[PDB]
Design a protein around this ligand. Structure first.
Ligand SMILES: [K+]
Ligand SMILES: [K+]
Ligand SMILES: [K+]
Ligand SMILES: [Mg+2]
Ligand SMILES: [Mg+2]
Ligand SMILES: [Mg+2]
Ligand SMILES: [Mg+2]
Ligand SMILES: [Mg+2]
Length: 52
RNA sequence: AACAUAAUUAAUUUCUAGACAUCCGUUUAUGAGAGGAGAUAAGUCGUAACAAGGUAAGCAUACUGGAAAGUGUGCUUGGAAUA
């Protein structure tokens, strides 16, 4: 899932609310939170920020 | 080359990338050298035309000649024509 979102930002394409939802749901470790925090930041600064 | 994301306010992105470089030609300038026309203006050689200009003149054309010009053939009068 990380790769999918990264490609979208590289191509300046909108990311789905379902995509960010799947990431947060499947957090399984303390380290994963740090990555999700970065992707929550990226989602906020993206065209579909309102749809969180 | 023209799709793909997204969508419980709604929008994002694509909506391209080469090759428009030479031209085939076309004008003008330059002019080795070879000619023409005109004027300069004392000359040279002849006297072709104007008088029946001393072989009437001229036209087209041909040949010939230092040069005007000469000769032929048909045509014209812008000549003459009684012995
Ligand atoms: K004569
Ligand atoms: K004479
Ligand atoms: K005469
Ligand atoms: Mg005579
Ligand atoms: Mg004579
Ligand atoms: Mg003649
Ligand atoms: Mg003769
Ligand atoms: Mg003779």
């Amino acid at each position: 899932l990380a790769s999918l979102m990264d490609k979208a930002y590289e191509r300046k394409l909108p990311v789905s609310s379902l995509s960010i939802s799947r990431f947060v749901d499947n957090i399984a470790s303390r380290e994963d939170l740090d990555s999700a925090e970065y992707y929550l930041y990226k989602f906020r600064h993206s065209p579909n920020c309102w749809y969180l």
